[PDB]
Amino acid sequence: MKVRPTVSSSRRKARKAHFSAPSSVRRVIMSAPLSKELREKYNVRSIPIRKGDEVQIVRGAHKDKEGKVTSVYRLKYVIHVERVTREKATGQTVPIGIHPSNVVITKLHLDKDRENILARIKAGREQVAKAKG
Amino acid sequence: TKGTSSFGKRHNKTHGLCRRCGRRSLHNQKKVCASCGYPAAKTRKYNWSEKAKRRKVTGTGRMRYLSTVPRRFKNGFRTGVPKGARGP
Amino acid sequence: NNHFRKHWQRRVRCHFDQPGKKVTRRLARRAKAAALAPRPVDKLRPIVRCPTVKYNRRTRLGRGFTLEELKAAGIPRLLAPTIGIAVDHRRKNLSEE
Amino acid sequence: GKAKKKGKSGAARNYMTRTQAVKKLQLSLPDFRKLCIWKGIYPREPRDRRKVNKSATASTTFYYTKDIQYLLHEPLLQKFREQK
Amino acid sequence: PSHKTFRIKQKLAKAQKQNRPIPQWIRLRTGNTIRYNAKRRHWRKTRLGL
Amino acid sequence: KAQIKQALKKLYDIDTVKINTLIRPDGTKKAFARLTPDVDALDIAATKLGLV
Amino acid sequence: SEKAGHQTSAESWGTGRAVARIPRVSGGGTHRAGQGAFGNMCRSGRMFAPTK
Amino acid sequence: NGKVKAGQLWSKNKEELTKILGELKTELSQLRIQKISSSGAKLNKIHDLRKSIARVLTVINAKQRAQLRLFYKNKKYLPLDLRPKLTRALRRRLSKEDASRVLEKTKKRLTHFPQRKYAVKA
Amino acid sequence: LRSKAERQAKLAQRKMNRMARQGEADRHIHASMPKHLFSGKRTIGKTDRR
RNA sequence: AAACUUUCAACAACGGAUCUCUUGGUUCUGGCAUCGAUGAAGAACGCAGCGAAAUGCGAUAAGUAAUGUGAAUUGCAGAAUUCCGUGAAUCAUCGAAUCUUUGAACGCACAUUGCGCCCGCCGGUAUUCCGGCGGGCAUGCCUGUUCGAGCGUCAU
RNA sequence: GUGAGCCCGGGUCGAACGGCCUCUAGUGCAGAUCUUGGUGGUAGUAGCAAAUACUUCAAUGAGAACUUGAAGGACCGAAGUGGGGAAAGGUUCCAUGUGAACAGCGGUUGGACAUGGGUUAGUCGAUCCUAAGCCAUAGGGAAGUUCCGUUUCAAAGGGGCAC
RNA sequence: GAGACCGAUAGCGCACAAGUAGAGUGAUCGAAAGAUGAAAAGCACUUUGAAAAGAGGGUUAAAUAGCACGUGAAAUUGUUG
RNA sequence: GGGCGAGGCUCCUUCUGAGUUCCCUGGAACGGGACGCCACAGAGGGUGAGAGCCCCGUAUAGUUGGAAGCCAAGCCUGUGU
């Protein structure tokens, strides 16, 4: 149960915020869990997904399909995974939108900012664990 | 002949465009706007038409300066730059 | 005898804000006590007797101590409001008691 | 476009008499002569003096309008007023 | 008429530039609700009111 | 007209004999600048303006 | 709201041969013109005994 | 080409900034004619040129205002655009010193009988 | 894509074509119950129409 | 007997009720005090590669700078991002800026993109002509400065 | 089940809902020349009859009385069914193309729809002048929004000369 | 931040490019209008028509969801019995 | 009369627990069954159907970095014109 007065439990306000959130907020909303190997390596549970990540789909009709994220299409809150496409009538291929909560990240596209994110999340989790233990 | 035949003589203009409020309500002979009361200093408004008041009240336009004021109040009308910011 | 011959609905006052106003008053009192600590939250009031023959059987707190009371207690009139004593120059002492 | 009016350009704008120069600079005659000598403002001669001033004679002194404009910005005017 | 003021001709210029149908790429946008120009003007239907 | 001819001289070294102007029905101004007979408007449009 | 169903200008067309005597929105050029107003039985009107 | 970054602009002084504004305006002037006479990827370049001109003008204005503030640092009267904005009511509000001025009798009374720190035993 | 957008533009006109408007600029709302035709009484004196 | 009219049923029409939904209203409660001549509210006109509107913005024109985040925007086209970075974004924040014609609206006017005046700067053969650019010129009132008027009161 | 109603079967459909006891109300419709919306008979009916009038061949086109060219026949009859303007309109002007809608019949045509193009001045107007008239200023009214006042009971400014 | 409130003829006039479209010389008056599908996967290709479209064949879990689009009542209409 | 002032408060910032385990239906489990785990968090929302443990958030102590104010235990000093 929420206790703070700045927290609202209004369903109308929650849906308005979710469907009118700007792009930087939608990046945080469009997060995906890490694989078990990545979680034990980095001590990180979830991270926002971006282009170049390797993902495995764990929900839906395209389950157990793996591939690279080719587009993070934030306008309909979906991602596109390579080779996870369907055929239009004319025979061309159109990508299939997958929600980031239906995939698991198997390989991270690593750079300086991603390492900073992982390091600060891991440090925060460790200091929370020491404070609460 | 007060109807259709008389309606054929309607080719003058009682009102022109008013410079201040943009409506076609500036009386061409009196030089007084029927809507906003130009060229009087005050804008014409009355309490017997709350619809007319809310058609032109503050916030129905652009708020080109007034919309920036609450953020400046929230930051306390501060001046200067962030410390270590690039510039002159 | 019902007085509803004016436009009474224009100035009907409801009191849904009674608990919120109690909360606001309590928060203001807490802030005042925290600002005034370790001093008391109020001033010392004298004991006075209510006027008229209906209420002269009962005593209550008054506004402030008289100048004669402060002089007989040895408290200067400029020091008295600075140490939590309320001062009333209008009241006089008509009796010894 | 619009028709020009006579006497609004040319020598009438190029020259002014000493009376007009003194009234323009709001000086006395000794101060004006002193400032003209100190700043090197020299007398001039129009081709036709009637085009500049209809009441001009042979003894009328003329000056350049731009020279009087330059004299308008001389800091000695404030010195003259301060001394007065 | 042929005799017109600069202000009047400027407002007529703005009306002439506004008098168009919507571009066809508008309807292909994601979440588009605009189907046609609902403020389109014609010289026989609605007066400019100048 | 003076601003148009000064702008043409400053931008393309173009010397004009006369300039006519009209405000078009869309609201923009159109200027007909007739060049001096010394220069060729076709050559100027080919080299500088690129209108071939 | 206390003003709901009352922000219209409407007058009855009187006793006649055609229509009911409900107040009707004046003016023209829109669907609302001539339509009933202010009644609890009318669309876009004030409800009977508004809640306080 | 056509993208000028603010980091290199912050180090220049006035002369080459006005120069670079001159070129960026000149390639904007030619590629407008290139836009009306042909097509391609040059539209990104005219967009970049417009933003570069905006950035250069911003840098020039900022450096001029910084120099003017340095010049007017120790002067009594400042230009109106260099004076602080706040609101009109804030600018007409009394100064802190004038609002804090008290009378001589009040100062003596506050000096010799201030509000004391005290407690009452229970 | 051009064929699809053109089909969308043609399908956007179906309601106004059923309403028989002369294009998207015809938004005229006519009076289907005029006050002079649906109010008042005819007396012995001056009438409002012949 | 059919057709026609009516009734009953199935399917198909017409029309948009019902049911479910709700980035919206309505009412209450809590907090806060912040418009404008340093030019407001409002109006008009413009600005995107491809927009009419809504939204945003002002010729630095769906925007600039600064801070932060850290890889997009998307309908198409075209370009990305040295990804181990002064750095995408229709991102957030926002202290520096820009801010057209107007409007209490302020040179005089305005049913005119009309007519001026003052002072500088630049260009065209130019002491004179022509053109452009910049800064200014409303009213009432207050304090002060300076220039004055009056046998109004005096001294000399 | 007397009844208001309740329950089930079958078909359709797609995300919520019900029984019992209490609590609560914007709680039960055939009417109000009721409101809004939708739909019939009338009825393929009334009608589409002022302004004298049309016809032939060819082309275009899926389709031609009302598109075009030619060929004929007529009308306006110079106070015109001609050639140009003022007000008003605002792009209706011109070229190219065109599904539907509109042109009370049709339509390949169109003032319709779509994309583009088009309005060049020292001499034509405006701009300048004043008329009938209107508005500032001085000053006086008015609680005031403002009213009167336009030459006033105003210090309301120009020129010249100077050793 | 909430509600024993309303759930698109309700609730603000406005849940939508709403004080908009539109009307009036003007003061002013002032609407109608939400819902395909989880995802456009918004029907390739063939055939008939000048075209609109139709039929095969497809997509979809479903077109008995085809941008006239959730469900699809009644008045009223067509066919069949 | 002056000057320090530990410490505290207000405001933006970094960070926080646990299943996508097996079976059935289904286009898609967020449904049913089984086995667990977290909980100062079983408020709310999203995700292809009713999700504490898929995601954002939610609870509580705190924990990074920054700015400007206020309160303040105490401590140095001038002394009476």
Ligand SMILES: [Zn+2]
């Ligand atoms: Zn006006």
